[PDB]
């Protein structure tokens, strides 16, 4: 039994220098690893060359499923194993089996000897040599490992007793903490020969004034955290079976990659493993443009429900956590699907991880939490776009099924965002829904479809006005109590106010505070007294007469002071990111936006529309004038699926509607983001949009149909060829990016706009 500390390769192929630990102390040994390659070539027969001293054998391994490669043809996959030195030798000559005619692909040329040994042997490698006593012969030369190998149990890797050191930069098992590992390793060649545990905290920043205290504070924690670092490293390593020095702490996708790869190798499935490459290794077919792949990697938008209105019943605000893991755990013709066998392997892995995590296991809990992050990361190895598409498509179905399940009992969906769900209840008072909420939660959890979902009620709503997530108001209570009248807080988040003149913004809020009070009073009166929700009929009668007089007075003052240069500070229309409307009369916008909020009732249409006409009579405008219609003042630019590294939260960020302090900070935890990452994601969105416009399909203006010719003038129908994506849409999309890049300081995106 050997405790390998740091597997390390060198210039010579199939050579692994190992800083192993023998019962005495640390020592250096070397391993020899042959190269195993997967050949798909020809349709039948075999080369019969015999020139190479290798081992070939016809195999039946389960290949991946690239959408382009769909033809079955025949099966003659091979399992050629051949040492890497003579493989480099064979690279030289022109004639050889690996480079000849009728070669479909090489499937595992990317995996290095280091990875092969760390996946096959592991941390606890032992010697089962026996035969002749070549232990001395094995130690003087390089011990060839292919013939003799065994992996002993690693339940207890080490009882630690050893010296630890530091080496840090702020631009013996030493710990390397530097922004540039490669530069420091190359500059001091002697640093290579010593074993190092490489933990990298990067991007040191300074306030540029009085930086000595902050340098001292940044040094103190790194000095004092040594006991924690080694302890956590050993805690991960004892379960991981990866050697301590190869493993890193922040690296979490590597554990998933090794475990999934070795449990796949337990089966006959091919790895498709690819190293420092964002795309899978499919044998070389992955280096060509394909329409299906381009569509499946450009579909990251999630559906949503935004049923708007004013609700006089109670509304529940539940938060659905563990959606993706629940989706995975629960569950020829198709050319765009992931292999079912690997899917079942992943399902079994997640099930066993969850079961061990239930029994007080920290590492299993970490793996379960980090699986969702691993799925969407291309930089993680074994990453497949088909897997991401499969997971997203099943999650999309799961959310609709959950909404339908909620629809089984008397309730109505209002909103759905993968993290928040709003439910309309039949009951009228929040104090009478304690039992029904619990019953619904138990019923939802009882279903086998949603056994692993986490649901928690965040707020109870008494009166809610809903337009979208960025524009709402009402009265809410955090949690209902006993024998005490429930405390209610009034919330009002209106982005619509930001596009108003400074003199009218206070008026907007003041009049909304009267609308809400009147609606609450009339609802209480209707409840006390006993097609239309009669709780809210007649609320406008209380505040109509004051509103008319106030509007008249405001109009008179505007007529008096609009041309006064002294009052030029007022009556200035702000410029905001996503603003497109060019509008003239400031008080008209206030009255329109105030009436639009009342209009979302669906039960008091006539009453509100009479008041709207009467108010519009103060101005010289008619009830159906085009200038008197409400449009949303703001555009939208939504970047989907941004990761919080310290929170493990999936959030969709919209750069136009969302107010600041939210663009650059996570929601669950108030941790700031990194700006250049946001700029790079915006650039990715822009270039992807341009590509999607450039690869669109054509259609007939009358026969809505797809063009099936490469050279034609028009439809067999007398018509014309038009585009599925019109130019005006992409022009507007390029327009909004320019404003977003100028309101906030994004130099990289501004440069990208000007290089077009
Ligand atoms: Zn967070
Ligand atoms: Zn036609």
UniProtKB/Swiss-Prot annotation:
<feature type="short sequence motif" description="CysB motif">
    <location>
        <begin position="700"/>
        <end position="717"/>
    </location>
</feature>
<protein>
    <recommendedName>
        <fullName>DNA polymerase epsilon catalytic subunit A</fullName>
    </recommendedName>
</protein>
<feature type="binding site">
    <location>
        <position position="666"/>
    </location>
    <ligand>
        <name>Zn(2+)</name>
    </ligand>
</feature>
<feature type="binding site">
    <location>
        <position position="669"/>
    </location>
    <ligand>
        <name>Zn(2+)</name>
    </ligand>
</feature>
<feature type="binding site">
    <location>
        <position position="644"/>
    </location>
    <ligand>
        <name>Zn(2+)</name>
    </ligand>
</feature>
<feature type="binding site">
    <location>
        <position position="703"/>
    </location>
    <ligand>
        <name>[4Fe-4S] cluster</name>
    </ligand>
</feature>
<feature type="binding site">
    <location>
        <position position="717"/>
    </location>
    <ligand>
        <name>[4Fe-4S] cluster</name>
    </ligand>
</feature>
<feature type="zinc finger region" description="CysA-type">
    <location>
        <begin position="644"/>
        <end position="669"/>
    </location>
</feature>
<feature type="binding site">
    <location>
        <position position="647"/>
    </location>
    <ligand>
        <name>Zn(2+)</name>
    </ligand>
</feature>
<feature type="binding site">
    <location>
        <position position="700"/>
    </location>
    <ligand>
        <name>[4Fe-4S] cluster</name>
    </ligand>
</feature>
<feature type="binding site">
    <location>
        <position position="715"/>
    </location>
    <ligand>
        <name>[4Fe-4S] cluster</name>
    </ligand>
</feature>
<comment type="subunit">
    <text>DNA polymerase epsilon is a heterotetramer consisting of POL2, DPB2, DPB3 and DPB4.</text>
</comment>
<comment type="function">
    <text>Catalytic component of the DNA polymerase epsilon complex which participates in chromosomal DNA replication. Required during synthesis of the leading DNA strands at the replication fork, binds at/or near replication origins and moves along DNA with the replication fork. Has 3'-5' proofreading exonuclease activity that corrects errors arising during DNA replication.</text>
</comment>
<comment type="similarity">
    <text>Belongs to the DNA polymerase type-B family.</text>
</comment>
């Amino acid at each position: 039994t050997w405790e390998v500390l740091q597997y390390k390769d060198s210039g010579e192929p199939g050579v692994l220098e190992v800083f192993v630990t023998i019962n005495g102390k640390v020592q250096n040994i070397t391993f020899h690893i042959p190269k195993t390659i997967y050949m798909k070539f020809k349709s039948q027969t075999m080369p019969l060359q015999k020139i190479k001293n290798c081992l070939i054998e016809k195999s039946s391994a389960s290949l991946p499923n690239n959408p382009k490669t769909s033809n079955p043809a025949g099966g003659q996959l091979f399992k050629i194993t051949l040492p890497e030195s003579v493989f480099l030798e064979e690279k030289e000559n022109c004639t050889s089996i690996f480079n000849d005619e009728n070669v479909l692909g090489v499937f595992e040329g990317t995996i290095t000897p280091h990875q092969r040994a760390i996946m096959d042997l592991g941390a606890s490698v032992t010697f089962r040599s026996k035969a002749m006593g070549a232990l001395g012969k094995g130690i003087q030369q390089g011990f060839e490992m292919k013939d003799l190998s065994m992996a002993e149990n690693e339940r207890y890797l080490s009882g630690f007793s050893m010296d630890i050191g530091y080496l840090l930069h702020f631009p013996f098992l030493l710990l390397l903490q530097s922004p540039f590992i490669t530069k420091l390793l190359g500059t001091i060649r002697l640093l290579n020969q010593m074993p190092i545990v490489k933990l990298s905290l990067n991007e040191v920043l300074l306030p540029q004034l009085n930086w000595q205290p902050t340098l001292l504070k940044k040094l103190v924690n790194h000095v004092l955290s040594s006991g924690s670092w080694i302890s956590h490293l050993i805690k991960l390593s004892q379960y991981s079976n990866i050697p301590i020095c190869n493993l890193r702490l922040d690296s979490m996708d590597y554990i998933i990659d090794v475990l999934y790869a070795r449990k796949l190798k337990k089966e006959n499935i091919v790895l498709w493993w690819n190293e420092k490459a964002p795309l899978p290794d499919h044998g070389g077919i992955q280096n060509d443009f394909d329409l299906n792949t381009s569509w499946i990697m450009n579909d990251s938008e999630f559906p949503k429900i935004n049923n708007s209105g004013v609700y006089d019943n109670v509304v529940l605000d539940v938060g659905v956590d563990n959606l993706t893991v629940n989706t995975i755990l629960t569950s020829e013709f198709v050319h765009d699907a992931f292999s079912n066998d690997a899917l079942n392997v992943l399902r079994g892995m997640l099930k066993e991880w969850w079961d061990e995590a239930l029994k007080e296991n920290s590492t299993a809990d970490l793996l379960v939490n980090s699986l969702a992050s691993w799925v969407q990361n291309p930089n993680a190895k074994l990453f497949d776009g088909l897997l991401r598409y499969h997971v997203h498509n099943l999650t999309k179905k799961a959310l609709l099924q959950l909404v339908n399940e909620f629809s089984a009992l008397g309730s109505t969906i209002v909103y759905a965002d993968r993290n928040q769900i709003l439910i309309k209840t039949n009951k009228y008072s929040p104090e009478n829904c304690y039992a029904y909420s619990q019953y619904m939660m138990k019923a939802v959890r009882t279903n086998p479809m949603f056994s692993y979902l986490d649901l928690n009620i965040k707020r109870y709503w008494d009166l809610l006005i809903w337009m979208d997530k960025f524009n709402f108001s009402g009265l809410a209570c955090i949690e209902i109590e006993e024998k005490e009248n429930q405390d209610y807080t009034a919330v009002s988040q209106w982005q619509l106010k930001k596009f108003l003149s400074p003199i009218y913004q206070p008026e907007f809020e003041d009049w909304m505070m009267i609308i809400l009070d009147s609606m609450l009073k009339t609802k209480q009166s209707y409840l006390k007294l006993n097609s239309v929700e009669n709780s809210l009929n007649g609320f406008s009668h209380l505040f109509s007469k004051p509103l008319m007089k106030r509007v008249k007075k405001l109009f008179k003052n505007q007529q008096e002071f609009i041309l006064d240069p002294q009052y030029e500070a007022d009556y200035v229309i702000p410029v905001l990111p996503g603003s497109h409307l060019n509008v003239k009369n400031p008080l008209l916008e206030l009255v329109k936006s105030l009436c639009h909020v009342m209009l979302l009732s669906k039960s008091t249409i006539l009453e509100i529309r009479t008041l709207r006409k009467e108010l519009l009579k103060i101005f010289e405008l008619r009830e159906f004038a085009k200038v008197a219609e409400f449009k949303d003042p703001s555009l939208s630019l939504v970047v989907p699926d941004f990761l919080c590294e310290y929170c493990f939260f999936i959030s969709d960020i919209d750069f136009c509607k969302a107010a600041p302090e939210s663009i650059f900070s996570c929601v669950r935890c108030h941790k700031a983001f990194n700006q250049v990452l946001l700029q790079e994601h915006l650039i990715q969105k822009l270039r992807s949009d341009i590509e999607s416009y450039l690869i669109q399909d054509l259609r007939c203006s009358r026969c809505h149909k797809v063009k099936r010719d490469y050279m034609s003038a028009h439809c067999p129908c007398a018509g014309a060829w038009e585009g599925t994506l019109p130019r005006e849409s992409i022009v507007q999309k390029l327009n909004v990016f320019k404003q977003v890049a100028k309101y906030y300081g994004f130099d990289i995106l501004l440069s990208c706009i000007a290089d077009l």
